């Protein structure tokens, strides 16, 4: 994985941004399979596992900054990308940032000028999950949720852990958390979703992109 | 209710400018 321009790649990236714009505006979510390729994705996974084994993950928290394991059962680490052993995570974030930048001005009326650090997450089996929720119900600035999944050879019948999305349609969209899949969806009340109980270690990275005007309301 | 179930977001001093 060259973490640092081919013509075919540059043209593909334009095509991907056009798909993302259309799919988010039309359906409220977009799936991109094989986003980084297996070599780069393996490096991301290896760095996430090394971080987890190093004992730096805390409990996932709710908007009141408290944890209730029966509501949200993941362990998380906030990663900016420049920490030791995180170059592949930084590479992922740069690829997502480039994708979002190519969509700027075409995603609703949002103006995206910032995002969270990477939220690296593990649901450590044991039937842990995240009950149905909305990422941004109260105008906290988050406009697009991006998930990157890291689970090789995952079988949801055995291991659960699907993301179930309920696009604001009368139907559930059941999404497997498969290795090297990117998922984007509007963060607000249009997209309730839940992480179904996981029966194996389930890894993912989240980036939340902010709408500048709404995000200002959170300044302190 | 959904208000209490949202995932925590670090406050703006931790935001990454694009
Ligand atoms: O990990 C997933 O598939 C979904 N995660 C969340 O919805 C979250 O942390 O808000
Ligand atoms: Mn969520």
Residue numbers in the entry:
A (entry chain A): 73 to 76, 81 to 244, 246 to 297
B (entry chain S): 480 to 497
Pull verbatim passages from the article behind this deposition:
Prolyl-4-hydroxylation of the oxygen dependent degradation domains (ODDs) in HIFα is catalyzed by the HIF prolyl hydroxylases (PHDs or EGLNs), and signals for HIFα degradation via the ubiquitin proteasome system. We have found that there is a functional HIFα-PHD-pVHL triad in the simplest animal, T. adhaerens. The HIF system in T. adhaerens is apparently markedly simpler than in humans because it contains only one PHD (TaPHD), and one HIFα isoform with a single ODD (TaODD). The structure of TaPHD contains the conserved double-stranded β-helix core-fold (DSBH, or “jelly roll”-motif), which is present in all characterized 2OG dependent oxygenases, including the human PHDs.
To gain insight into the substrate-binding mode of TaPHD, we then co-crystallized TaPHD64-300 with a 21mer peptide fragment of its substrate, the TaHIFα ODD (TaODD, residues E477-L497), Mn(II) and N-oxalylglycine (NOG), a close 2OG analog. The TaPHD.TaODD.Mn.NOG structure was solved to a resolution of 1.3 Å by molecular replacement, using the structure without TaODD as a search model. Eighteen residues of the 21mer TaODD peptide (A480TaODD-L497TaODD) are visible in the TaPHD.TaODD structure. In the substrate-bound structure, however, the β2/β3-finger-loop is ordered and makes extensive contacts with the substrate. The 6-coordinate state of the metal is retained in the TaPHD.TaODD complex. NOG coordinates to the metal ion in a bidentate manner and interacts with R279TaPHD by its C5 carboxylate. The main substrate binding elements in the TaPHD.TaODD complex structure, as in HsPHD2, comprise: the active site containing groove, the β2/β3-finger-loop, and the C-terminal α4-helix. The TaODD peptide binds to TaPHD in an extended form; notably, the residues N-terminal to the target proline form a 310-helix. As observed in the HsPHD2.CODD/NODD structures, the substrate proline P486TaODD pyrrolidine ring adopts a C-4 endo-conformation, with the 4R C-H bond that is cleaved during hydroxylation, being positioned close to the metal center (distance: 4.5 Å); indeed, the conformations of the substrate target prolyl rings at the TaPHD and HsPHD2 active sites are nearly identical. Notably, the Pro-Pro-Pro motif and the adjacent 310-helix constitute the interaction surface with the C-terminal α4-helix of TaPHD.
